[PDB]
Amino acid sequence: ETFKALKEYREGQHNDSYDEYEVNQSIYYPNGGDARKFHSNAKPRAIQIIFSPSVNVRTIK
Amino acid sequence: ADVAGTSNRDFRGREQRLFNSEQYNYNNSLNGEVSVWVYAYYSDGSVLVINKNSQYKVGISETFKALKEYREGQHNDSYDEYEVNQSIYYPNGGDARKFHSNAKPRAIQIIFSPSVNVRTIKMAKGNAVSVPDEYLQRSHPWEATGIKYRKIKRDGEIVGYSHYFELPHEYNSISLAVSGVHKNPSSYNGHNVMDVFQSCDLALRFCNRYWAELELVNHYISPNAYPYLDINNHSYGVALSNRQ
Amino acid sequence: ADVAGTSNRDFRGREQRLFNSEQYNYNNSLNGEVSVWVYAYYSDGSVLVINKNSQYKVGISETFKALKEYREGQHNDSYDEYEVNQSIYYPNGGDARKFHSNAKPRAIQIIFSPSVNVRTIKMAKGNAVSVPDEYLQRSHPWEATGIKYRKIKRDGEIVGYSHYFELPHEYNSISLAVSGVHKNPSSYNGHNVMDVFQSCDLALRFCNRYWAELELVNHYISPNAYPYLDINNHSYGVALSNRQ
Amino acid sequence: ADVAGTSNRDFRGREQRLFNSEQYNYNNSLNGEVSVWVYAYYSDGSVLVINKNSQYKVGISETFKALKEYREGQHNDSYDEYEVNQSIYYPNGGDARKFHSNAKPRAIQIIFSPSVNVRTIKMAKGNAVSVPDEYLQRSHPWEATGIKYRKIKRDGEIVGYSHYFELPHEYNSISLAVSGVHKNPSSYNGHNVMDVFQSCDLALRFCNRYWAELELVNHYISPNAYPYLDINNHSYGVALSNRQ
Ligand SMILES: Nc1ncnc2c1ncn2[C@@H]1O[C@H](COP(=O)(O)OP(=O)(O)OP(=O)(O)O)[C@@H](O)[C@H]1O
Ligand SMILES: Nc1ncnc2c1ncn2[C@@H]1O[C@H](COP(=O)(O)OP(=O)(O)OP(=O)(O)O)[C@@H](O)[C@H]1O
Ligand SMILES: Nc1ncnc2c1ncn2[C@@H]1O[C@H](COP(=O)(O)OP(=O)(O)OP(=O)(O)O)[C@@H](O)[C@H]1O
Ligand SMILES: Nc1ccn([C@@H]2O[C@H](COP(=O)(O)OP(=O)(O)OP(=O)(O)O)[C@@H](O)[C@H]2O)c(=O)n1
Ligand SMILES: Nc1ccn([C@@H]2O[C@H](COP(=O)(O)OP(=O)(O)OP(=O)(O)O)[C@@H](O)[C@H]2O)c(=O)n1
Ligand SMILES: Nc1ccn([C@@H]2O[C@H](COP(=O)(O)OP(=O)(O)OP(=O)(O)O)[C@@H](O)[C@H]2O)c(=O)n1
Ligand SMILES: Nc1ccn([C@@H]2O[C@H](COP(=O)(O)OP(=O)(O)OP(=O)(O)O)[C@@H](O)[C@H]2O)c(=O)n1
Ligand SMILES: [Cl-]
Ligand SMILES: [Cl-]
Ligand SMILES: [Cl-]
Ligand SMILES: [Mg+2]
Ligand SMILES: [Mg+2]
Ligand SMILES: [Mg+2]
Ligand SMILES: [Mg+2]
Ligand SMILES: [Mg+2]
Ligand SMILES: [Mg+2]
Ligand SMILES: [Mg+2]
CA-based nearest residue to B213, from B232, B240, B185, B194: B232
Q: Is B82 in the pocket of ligand 5 (CB under 6 A)?
A: no
CA distance C86 to D74: 40
Q: Which helix (H) or strand (E) holds B216?
A: helix B213-216
Tell me if A7 sits within 8 A of A42, measured CB to CB. yes
Identify the residue whose C-alpha is closest to ligand 1 atom 8.
B155
- Ligand 7 atom at minimum distance from D83 CA: 1
Among left, alpha and beta (phi > 0; psi -120 to 50; other), residue D237 is left
Q: Is D38 helix (H, G, I), strand (E, B) or coil?
A: strand
Inform me whether the C-beta atom of residue C225 falls under 8 Å from chain B C-beta atoms. Answer: yes
Cβ distance of A21 and D223 shorter than 8 Å: no
CA distance C89 to B147: 51
Which residue among B46, B74, B97 sits closest to A38, beta carbon to beta carbon? B46
- Crossing angle (nearest 10°) for helices B193-202 and C193-202: 20
Residue B191 is given by DSSP the state: T
Q: Tell me the resolution in Å.
A: 1.5
Q: Is B233 in the pocket of ligand 1 (CB under 6 A)?
A: no
What backbone phi and psi angles, to 5 degrees, belong to D96? -90, 160
CA distance D244 to D240: 7
How far are the Cα atoms of A32, D13, D50, D165 from residue D216, in angstroms, in the given order? 11, 33, 12, 18
Count CB neighbours of C165 within 10 A. Answer: 15
CA distance B203 to D30: 72
What backbone phi and psi angles, to 5 degrees, belong to B228? -160, 155
Count Cβ neighbours within 10 Å for each residue of A19-56 and write b for 16 or more, e otherwise.
bbbbbbbbbbeeebbebebbbbbbeeeeeeeeeeeeee
Cβ-proximal residues to D180 (8 Å cutoff; 6+ apart), any chain: D34, D36, D57, D58, D59, D112, D116, D117, D118, D120, D121, D122
Hey, CA dihedral for A51, A52, A57, A59, is it positive or negative?
negative
- Ligand 5 atom at minimum distance from B94 CA: 1
Ligand 8 centroid vs B61 CA: distance in angstroms?
A: 28
Q: Which of A37, A40, A43 to mutate to test the interface with B (most CBs of B within 10 A)?
A: A37
- Cα-based angle B16, B17, B22 (whole degrees, multiple of 5): 100
CA distance C72 to B70: 13
Count Cβ neighbours within 10 Å for each residue of B111-125 and write b for 16 or more, e otherwise.
bbbbbbbbebbbbbb
Q: How many helices (H) and strands (E) does chain D have?
A: 4, 11
Tell me if D159 sits within 8 A of D237, measured CB to CB. yes
Amino acid in position D105: P
Hey, CA dihedral for C190, C195, C196, C197, is it positive or negative?
positive
Identify the residue whose C-alpha is closest to ligand 4 atom 14.
A16
How far are the Cα atoms of B70, B83, C38, C47, C221 from residue C210, in angstroms, in the given order? 22, 11, 13, 5, 11
CA distance C123 to C60: 10
Cβ-proximal residues to D109 (8 Å cutoff; 6+ apart), any chain: D37, D38, D39, D41, D162, D163, D164, D229
* Structure-determination approach: X-ray
C touches D (3+ CB pairs < 8 Å)? no
For the range C16-23, what are the long-range contacts, defined as Cβ-Cβ under 8 Å and sequence gap of 24 or more?
A: C16/C244, C17/C242, C17/C243, C17/C244, C20/C240, C20/C241, C20/C242, C20/C243, C20/C244, C21/C240, C21/C241, C21/C242, C21/C243, C22/B138, C23/B135, C23/B137, C23/B138, C23/C240
Tell me if C33 sits within 8 A of B139, measured CB to CB. yes
Which residue among A24, A59, A61 sits closest to D208, beta carbon to beta carbon? A24
For the range C184-192, what are the long-range contacts, defined as Cβ-Cβ under 8 Å and sequence gap of 24 or more?
A: C184/C30, C184/C117, C186/C30, C188/C30
Amino acid in position A51: F
How far are the Cα atoms of B193, C11, C13, C17 from residue C7, in angstroms, in the given order? 57, 9, 10, 15
Ligand 15 centroid vs C152 CA: distance in angstroms?
A: 11
Q: Is A35 in the pocket of ligand 4 (CB under 6 A)?
A: yes
What number of residues does chain A have?
61
Which residue among B77, B97, B211 sits closest to A36, beta carbon to beta carbon? B211
Inform me whether the C-beta atom of residue C64 falls under 8 Å from chain B C-beta atoms. Answer: no
Could you write out the three-class secondary structure of D225-241? Answer: CCCEECCCCCEECCCCC
CA distance B84 to B99: 8
Count CB neighbours of D200 within 10 A. Answer: 12
CA distance B27 to B22: 8
Tell me if D163 sits within 8 A of D176, measured CB to CB. no
Tell me if C29 sits within 8 A of C9, measured CB to CB. no
Tell me if C27 sits within 8 A of C21, measured CB to CB. no
**Torsion angle, alpha carbons of D118, D122, D127, D129, to 10:** -140
CA-based nearest residue to C144, from C173, C172, C181: C181
Chain-centre distance of CA C93, in angstroms? 32
Cβ-proximal residues to D76 (8 Å cutoff; 6+ apart), any chain: D69, D70, D103
Count CB neighbours of B226 within 10 A. Answer: 22
Q: Looking at C39-97, list the stretches that DSSP marks H as alpha helix, in order from N- to C-terminal side.
A: 64-67, 78-89
How far are the Cα atoms of A46, B26, B206 from residue B159, in angstroms, in the given order? 39, 14, 20
Cβ distance of B45 and A39 shorter than 8 Å: yes
* Beta partners for residue B38, in sequence order: B50, B110
Cβ distance of D73 and A25 shorter than 8 Å: no
